[PDB]
Amino acid sequence: PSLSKEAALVHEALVARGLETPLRPPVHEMDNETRKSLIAGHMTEIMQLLNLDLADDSLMETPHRIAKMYVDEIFSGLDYANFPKITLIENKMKVDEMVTVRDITLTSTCEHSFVTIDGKATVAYIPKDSVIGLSKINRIVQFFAQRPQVQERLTQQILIALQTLLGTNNVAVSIDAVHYCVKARGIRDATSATTTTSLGGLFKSSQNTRHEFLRAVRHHN
Amino acid sequence: PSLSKEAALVHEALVARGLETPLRPPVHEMDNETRKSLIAGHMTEIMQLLNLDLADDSLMETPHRIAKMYVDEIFSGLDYANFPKITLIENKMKVDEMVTVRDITLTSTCEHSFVTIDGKATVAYIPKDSVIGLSKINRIVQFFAQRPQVQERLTQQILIALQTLLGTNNVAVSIDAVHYCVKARGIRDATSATTTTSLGGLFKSSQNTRHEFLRAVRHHN
Amino acid sequence: PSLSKEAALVHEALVARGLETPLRPPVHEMDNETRKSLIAGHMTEIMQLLNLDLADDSLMETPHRIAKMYVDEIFSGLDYANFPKITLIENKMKVDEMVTVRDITLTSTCEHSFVTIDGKATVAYIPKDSVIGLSKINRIVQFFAQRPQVQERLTQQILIALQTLLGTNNVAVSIDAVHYCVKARGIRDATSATTTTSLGGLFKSSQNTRHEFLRAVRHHN
Amino acid sequence: PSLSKEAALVHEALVARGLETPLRPPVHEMDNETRKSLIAGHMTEIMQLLNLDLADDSLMETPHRIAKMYVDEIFSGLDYANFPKITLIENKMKVDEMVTVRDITLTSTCEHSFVTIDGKATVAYIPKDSVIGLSKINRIVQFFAQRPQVQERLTQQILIALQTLLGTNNVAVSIDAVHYCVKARGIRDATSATTTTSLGGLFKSSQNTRHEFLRAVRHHN
Amino acid sequence: PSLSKEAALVHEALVARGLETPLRPPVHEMDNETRKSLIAGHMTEIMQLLNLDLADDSLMETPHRIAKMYVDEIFSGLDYANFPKITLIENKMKVDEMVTVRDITLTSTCEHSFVTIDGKATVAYIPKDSVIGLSKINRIVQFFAQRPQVQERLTQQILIALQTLLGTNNVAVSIDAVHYCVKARGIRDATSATTTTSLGGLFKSSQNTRHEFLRAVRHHN
Numbered sequence A, B, C, D, E: 001p002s003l004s005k006e007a008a009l010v011h012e013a014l015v016a017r018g019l020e021t022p023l024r025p026p027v028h029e030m031d032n033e034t035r036k037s038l039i040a041g042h043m044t045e046i047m048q049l050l051n052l053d054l055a056d057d058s059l060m061e062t063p064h065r066i067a068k069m070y071v072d073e074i075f076s077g078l079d080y081a082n083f084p085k086i087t088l089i090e091n092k093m094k095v096d097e098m099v100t101v102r103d104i105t106l107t108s109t110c111e112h113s114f115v116t117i118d119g120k121a122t123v124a125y126i127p128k129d130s131v132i133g134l135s136k137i138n139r140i141v142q143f144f145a146q147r148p149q150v151q152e153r154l155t156q157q158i159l160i161a162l163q164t165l166l167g168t169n170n171v172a173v174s175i176d177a178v179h180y181c182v183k184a185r186g187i188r189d190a191t192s193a194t195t196t197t198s199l200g201g202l203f204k205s206s207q208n209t210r211h212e213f214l215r216a217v218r219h220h221n
């Protein structure tokens, strides 16, 4: 057992564009359970440097939980084994029409401060020879989202990934997000949100389809 | 007593495009109440395999209800005898005007998992030689919706159906829908929805009428 | 005492287009109070054929009310004597700019089943040599609405009526409506509404003024 | 002491287009308090002819109030001495940007029935050689509004006045209003509102700037 | 130590366009704390001339607070030492697509009357060779907001500043604001709001990108 076919095509398409998240070569595969205990040991050190009482039955289990978050939960997208099982249906229908999946739940983490990014993604495409399974779009968005991210990079990764799998450039990706390092810290902007949009094919070059997406982006319920 | 003229034209039109829902030869005719008792019998087996007590006063009538649902209710659009009796008014008013029927109640079932699809349809057309009865648009939408469906196929079926009966390519169909196999299971995206839009004639080729529909797409109340 | 000047120009402009609601020649003039008693008598028979107790102090006055409604109230627009007294001010200001009267209360009745149509109208025009009085637009919409109507014909009757009175083709009429024969009966579509738009002049031919109206159509409060 | 420079340019610009009363030779006449006493006297007569008890301590002061209203309050826009003191800042910013002042409180009276007009104005312009003081746009709208008005004329007066003061044709004025002579009387349309828009310069001729304004027109809060 | 590189490049770019004051001080080295006591002394005199009792435990500390506000807080943007530490990420991604930061908290002051301006800023740009850090856009808007401003000037100061740092003309700035010198005094317009928009590069010249921003401007939550 290794990786997957669709995971490989996406990975190589992204490396070819320099869109991979800053990752150094694996070298050796240390035990997953050892990684957690070492990170937990390092977080125990951090908390003691901040004058926190680890003798308390609540702050005691915290280093274990931060470690379990880093390795098995929030950064699961760095491992291509967690890549969704892509299912493409043959365009028997000759669908020359558009599909838009709006308000996709996007949960990420800013690579600059390891703080939460709450977002919504809108993906639209025009089927060429294949129609992707609906949930797979939500799963691709979430795969790249669960990584230490940069919103502009993230938007591109999702675009190129969908472009590769569908064999069409006619894909559009928009991510409307709130970065908590902007909101709950620093400038403390309680009302601002960032939208980063990547247009491809007809959504870019042709004037027509460019305005067909951009207007239908930003929806509430 | 057999079928209907309008139902025949639509059927032939969809078959010619490869849009007729995956159906195998119906060579024989087994009694309607026999198919319900057999499906009920098969559902009684499924429930026993799930460790559910069928001796309970409410779980007891469940296999008969799922049987009655599949045969007489939710999949009624598989039978062209249930096709709406279309009324066409002759356009002696000669109007080159646009009619849009939005927020059409659409109740379907995903063919991939037999789970609920809650949706809303938007149909727009420019009358040529005939004006269709308003309710028949709502009924056509629902006829094709009461089938094990794929959202992209459903949209095209309603388009081609309305294009055939009205004798114009000038028809636009958009379906906004929530798939419960996406929302209440799997990826569990509580916020996402999918819009599939089929543009034909002036709504497709001509630049003007394309943005006339797409802007008036998705309205709330 | 006969009819009106403005009523005549409109009537003949609509007859020349085949837009006047399908009516047969009146031949003789039958007493208005006799037509009520006749209709009331026919409704008393309909109610009897439905097992209703006419000896009841409430259902007793119902035939009289439905008679009063059909002759003096809801169908008053079939009588051109009820046509609004139109007043036009000369364009001394040389106004080559637009006027839009949105959310006009439209109360009609479907010709198909004599059931209530609840609508809202949006009328826009560009004054040429005359500016029409504001309430006269509301009254024109209501004159043609108080008739057994078809939404597509209703929209056109308002359009041509306004076009004739203003001496310009630069008029746009849009009616957004809920038909209770679609909502509270048959298909029972609780959420759907129908929008019928008739564009004229620059709102039709010219690309610019076309999307000036259509965008500012469908407003809530 | 007489008038003002800014009041004079606007006055003649409007007279030149038939939007204002031409300046006639300086007469002289009544004392402002004699005008009120005479109007109050005529209102006392009107109320007597309507069988109202003027001996009651409430309806007693009504003729005096309607008199004060007509002379000093609601029609103060008829006297150019009440014209706002306009301040123009030299554009050595040299900016080719656009300024939009929306939802400007507009309180008028229809000249047809002396009944209240509740409106909201939206003004946009592109600075050429000068930038007008913000509040002055609101004050100009209110100057022309406090008069017996016609919505279409009111829109043109504000347009030309702003065009003259700014030395640019690049101004757009839009008034969204509810006439109470349409709402609380006659047709009794409780839902309608009228929008009258005047476009000049690039907001008219150029297709680009035309849709820049008209889209950002009609905002709530 | 004294200033910043990115601060100097922006200052220079603004002086070159007449949007800033030529940096000429050090003044006669007035101690930060003596400027406060002198301003507090001048405000004590103003309050005395308005006949307010300074012996009251509440009004006593007011001159000190207004001084502290003027010197250390609300006018902090007049000193380029307070300019944010800009971070530019190299465009490794070759991203030819857009970033929009909407609903930016903007807190300013009427240069005309020293009164509060409550605003929201919307900044958009297409990254050329650099991607600026998200919070920096918020921080730049607030730097220029924290000084006695003129909204049309503020909008441009932000545009040019971002155009300079990013090395692109493709930047769009829109400020939506409520001036309390218009709302709570004078004309007393409780509902008006002023939007000032500055479009550069593709957002101005090219017709596509101009309508991509202006449509996505003015968002609530």
Ligand SMILES: Nc1nc2c(ncn2[C@@H]2O[C@H](COP(=O)(O)OP(=O)(O)OP(=O)(O)O)[C@@H](O)[C@H]2O)c(=O)[nH]1
Binding pocket: A110, A111, A112, A113, A149, A150, A151, A152, A179, A181, A182, A185, A186, A187, E085, E086, E087, E131, E132, E133, E134, E135, E136, E139
């Ligand atoms: N373009 C972009 N910038 C990001 C993203 N995430 C974080 N940033 C920005 O990168 C910058 C980090 O700059 P630094 O100078 O280290 O300062 P900081 O303390 O992190 O940020 P502030 O204190 O908030 O100004 C900030 O402007 C963050 O807002 C992201 O996805 N895209």
Ligand SMILES: Nc1nc2c(ncn2[C@@H]2O[C@H](COP(=O)(O)OP(=O)(O)OP(=O)(O)O)[C@@H](O)[C@H]2O)c(=O)[nH]1
Binding pocket: A085, A087, A131, A132, A133, A134, A135, A136, B110, B111, B112, B113, B149, B150, B151, B152, B179, B181, B182, B185, B186, B187
């Ligand atoms: N294009 C399209 N895909 C659909 C439609 N209905 C269901 N699907 C997708 O078809 C896929 C089924 O792929 P499978 O690999 O069998 O996975 P699954 O367990 O059924 O679905 P998920 O767990 O939700 O990914 C999913 O991506 C569904 O969301 C539909 O109308 N159109």
Ligand SMILES: Nc1nc2c(ncn2[C@@H]2O[C@H](COP(=O)(O)OP(=O)(O)OP(=O)(O)O)[C@@H](O)[C@H]2O)c(=O)[nH]1
Binding pocket: B085, B086, B087, B131, B132, B133, B134, B135, B136, C110, C111, C112, C113, C149, C150, C151, C152, C179, C181, C182, C185, C186, C187
């Ligand atoms: N185009 C149009 N159709 C209308 C209008 N009013 C009613 N109709 C349609 O005319 C049709 C009546 O066709 P029938 O075959 O008599 O059916 P019905 O039982 O009266 O109506 P349903 O039960 O709702 O299908 C329906 O499709 C109505 O919705 C109207 O103003 N315009």
Ligand SMILES: Nc1nc2c(ncn2[C@@H]2O[C@H](COP(=O)(O)OP(=O)(O)OP(=O)(O)O)[C@@H](O)[C@H]2O)c(=O)[nH]1
Binding pocket: C085, C086, C087, C131, C132, C133, C134, C135, C136, D110, D111, D112, D113, D149, D150, D151, D152, D179, D181, D182, D185, D186, D187
């Ligand atoms: N175009 C325009 N029409 C206006 C304006 N103010 C009033 N009117 C219209 O002028 C007309 C008055 O016409 P009349 O024949 O005297 O009727 P009325 O009894 O005064 O008014 P209604 O009963 O409401 O028709 C109406 O249509 C009003 O709505 C205005 O500012 N612009």
Ligand SMILES: Nc1nc2c(ncn2[C@@H]2O[C@H](COP(=O)(O)OP(=O)(O)OP(=O)(O)O)[C@@H](O)[C@H]2O)c(=O)[nH]1
Binding pocket: D085, D086, D087, D131, D132, D133, D134, D135, D136, E110, E111, E112, E113, E149, E150, E151, E152, E181, E182, E185, E186, E187
């Ligand atoms: N264009 C612009 N005008 C501004 C700005 N700030 C204040 N103003 C305007 O400059 C004018 C000040 O004119 P003045 O004649 O001194 O009157 P004022 O008493 O300050 O203001 P008002 O009583 O509100 O008319 C007003 O119209 C203000 O609204 C601003 O940022 N931009």
